């Protein structure tokens, strides 16, 4: 597949374990972030002091999650989980496993 | 040209009004941000009522961007202290006609 970069938010929909998430392609970040309101409450988290040059105390998934796209490509990511965030943010941890290129005409 | 997305920082080097800047390709940002520490002090910046979700300074003038293939256009970046890297937002990336592609 192919997606132009425009002033529109560049978005991707995929599954993490059984659940569907939509988020913004975020090439500026090496890690993925899930909005806490979208986090399934039974999924375990670990508090961290990881400095995200966002917040410096994010929660993180305890477990690796299996990501899957609509073409059934898959792999593992371990996202941070942050409140007060308007959109999920797909970072280069995930984008690198989907073999995404940036291309110019 | 082509640039894979990897764990490495995806970077672009270009000119803004004939000074060279290097920055991170930032698809999650609507607007471009230049480090105040990199900002030529003679280039005027102005206060804004704009919030970034911060009340930041902005280039008073449109800048002409140019890439190494001599493509060009205009941007008016925000200018913010205490950032690690310049950030190329979709304002600039949309004008360079950039695709994201999967094999």
């Amino acid at each position: 597949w192919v997606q132009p970069i425009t002033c529109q938010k560049p978005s991707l929909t995929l599954w993490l374990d059984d659940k569907m998430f939509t988020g913004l392609i975020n090439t500026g970040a090496d890690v993925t972030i899930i909005k806490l309101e979208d986090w399934p409450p039974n999924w375990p988290i670990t508090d961290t002091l990881t400095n995200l040059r966002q917040s410096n105390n994010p929660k993180q998934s305890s477990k690796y999650l299996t990501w899957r796209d609509k073409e059934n490509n898959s792999g593992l990511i371990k996202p941070f989980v942050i409140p007060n965030l308007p959109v999920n943010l797909w970072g280069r941890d995930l984008l690198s496993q989907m073999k995404i290129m940036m291309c110019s005409p | 040209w082509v640039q894979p997305i990897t764990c490495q920082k995806p970077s672009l080097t270009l000119w803004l009004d004939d000074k060279m800047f290097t920055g991170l390709i930032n698809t999650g940002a609507d607007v471009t941000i230049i480090k105040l520490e990199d900002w030529p002090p003679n280039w005027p910046i102005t206060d804004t009522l704009t919030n970034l979700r911060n009340n930041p300074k902005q280039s008073s003038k449109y800048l002409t961007w140019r890439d190494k293939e001599n493509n060009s256009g205009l941007i008016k970046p925000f200018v913010i202290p205490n950032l690690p890297v310049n950030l190329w937002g979709r304002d600039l990336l949309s004008q360079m006609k950039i695709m994201m592609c999967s094999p």
């Binding site: 959109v87 | 940002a29 690690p84």
Partner: peptide
Amino acid sequence: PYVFAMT
């Protein structure tokens, strides 16, 4: 606007 970077 919205600005989503961090090491």
